[PDB]
A paper describes a structure:
Tripartite ATP-independent periplasmic (TRAP) transporters are secondary transporters that have evolved an obligate dependence on a substrate-binding protein (SBP) to confer unidirectional transport. We investigated the significance of this interaction using the sialic acid-specific SBP, SiaP, from the Haemophilus influenzae virulence-related SiaPQM TRAP transporter. Using in vitro, in vivo, and structural methods applied to SiaP, we demonstrate that the coordination of the acidic ligand moiety of sialic acid by the conserved arginine (Arg-147) is essential for the function of the transporter as a high affinity scavenging system.
To understand the structural consequences of removing the Arg-147 from SiaP, we crystallized the R147A and R147K mutants in the presence of 10–15 mm Neu5Ac. The other contact is now mediated by a water molecule that provides the missing H-bond to the carboxylate of Neu5Ac.
Residue numbers in the entry: 1 to 308
Write the structure that this text describes.
């Protein structure tokens, strides 16, 4: 086709993220009357989110996904998006990004500094903790070899609750869990299902610790080359796909607890009071290390009312 574009993602071909990406690709091809084709490159074939973000800056990849929190890699105060228990729900994540001065400044910085245009935002689940032994209480986290992604906020989650974080790549996790070289991991339910981590974890704790969004991103290199009518086609299709993306996650969080129960998994509901208490020292370190931009991002996020 005239523009042969590529969409890279960490997620696999059974994931919600991929399904929404298929919808995005399909609308774009149609409403562009065939001028744009978007091919999918899942399962981190192109490298992980960090790597793919660098390919979008360079212009060697055209689209990818990223959480708002992943931009803590460049702007330390963007960690606020993933300080555990700080963002209440997805309504708060939406207003954080689009309706605060911090948020709006982060978007403009994404474009001018990092070579990426934010097209849409979806919901990608609330993270929970699976494991090979029960998590009845925060005490059960002691010495747990918990698999985390390569991100400072997830490592901090593990540390401060008394677990032993082993960072690793997503594609590696399943075997690690099965052999028990690690004891647990902490994705939203959707990914626990997509990656089938429920086949090699008898236990799931509802730790509700981090709220993931997902941003549909396009390389500026690619976006600037598209005529404005085709820019609007890609922009609209990204908003349509985001809304669908959010619905897949919302509908699944209802039904998946029962799906895991049927699959022989044992669900616990530990007291979150001490989880939340364990993090105050981390919030203090966060303000200490990120300074006044950081206390100003927290202030703006904590002021957002979580009720629609
Ligand atoms: C857009 C994207 O790639 N998200 C990925 C996130 C982020 O990389 C991480 O949370 C840091 O923000 O990590 C996972 O949860 C993980 O490796 O377990 C998989 C998920 O697909």
């Amino acid at each position: 086709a005239d523009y042969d574009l590529k969409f890279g993602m960490n997620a696999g071909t059974s994931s919600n993220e991929y399904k929404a990406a298929e919808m995005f690709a399909k609308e774009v091809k149609e409403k562009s009357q065939g001028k744009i084709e978007i091919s999918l490159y899942p399962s981190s074939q192109l490298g992980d989110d960090r790597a793919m973000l660098k390919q979008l800056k360079d212009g060697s990849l055209d689209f990818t996904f990223a959480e708002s929190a992943r931009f803590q890699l460049f702007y330390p105060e963007a960690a606020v998006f993933a300080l555990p228990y700080v963002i209440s729900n997805y309504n708060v994540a939406q207003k954080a990004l689009f309706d605060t001065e911090f948020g709006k400044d982060l978007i403009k910085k994404m474009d001018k500094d990092l070579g990426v245009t934010l097209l849409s935002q979806a919901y990608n689940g609330t993270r929970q903790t699976t494991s090979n032994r029960a998590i009845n209480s925060i005490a059960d986290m002691k010495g747990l070899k918990l698999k985390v992604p390569n991100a400072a906020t997830n490592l901090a989650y593990a540390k401060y609750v008394g677990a032993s974080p082993t960072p690793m790549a997503f594609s590696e996790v399943y075997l690690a869990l099965q052999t028990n070289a690690v004891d647990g991991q902490e994705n939203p339910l959707a990914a626990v299902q997509a990656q089938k981590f429920y086949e090699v974890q008898k236990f799931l704790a509802m730790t509700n610790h981090i709220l993931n969004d997902q941003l549909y991103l396009v390389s500026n290199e690619t976006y600037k080359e598209l005529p404005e009518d085709l820019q609007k086609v890609v922009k609209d299709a990204a908003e349509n796909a985001a809304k669908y993306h959010t619905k897949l996650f919302v509908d699944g969080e209802k039904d998946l607890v029962t799906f895991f129960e049927k699959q022989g998994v044992k669900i616990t509901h530990p007291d979150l009071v001490p989880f939340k208490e364990s993090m105050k020292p981390y919030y203090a370190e966060f303000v200490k290390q990120t300074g006044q931009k950081g206390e100003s991002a927290l202030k703006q996020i904590e002021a957002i009312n979580p009720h629609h």
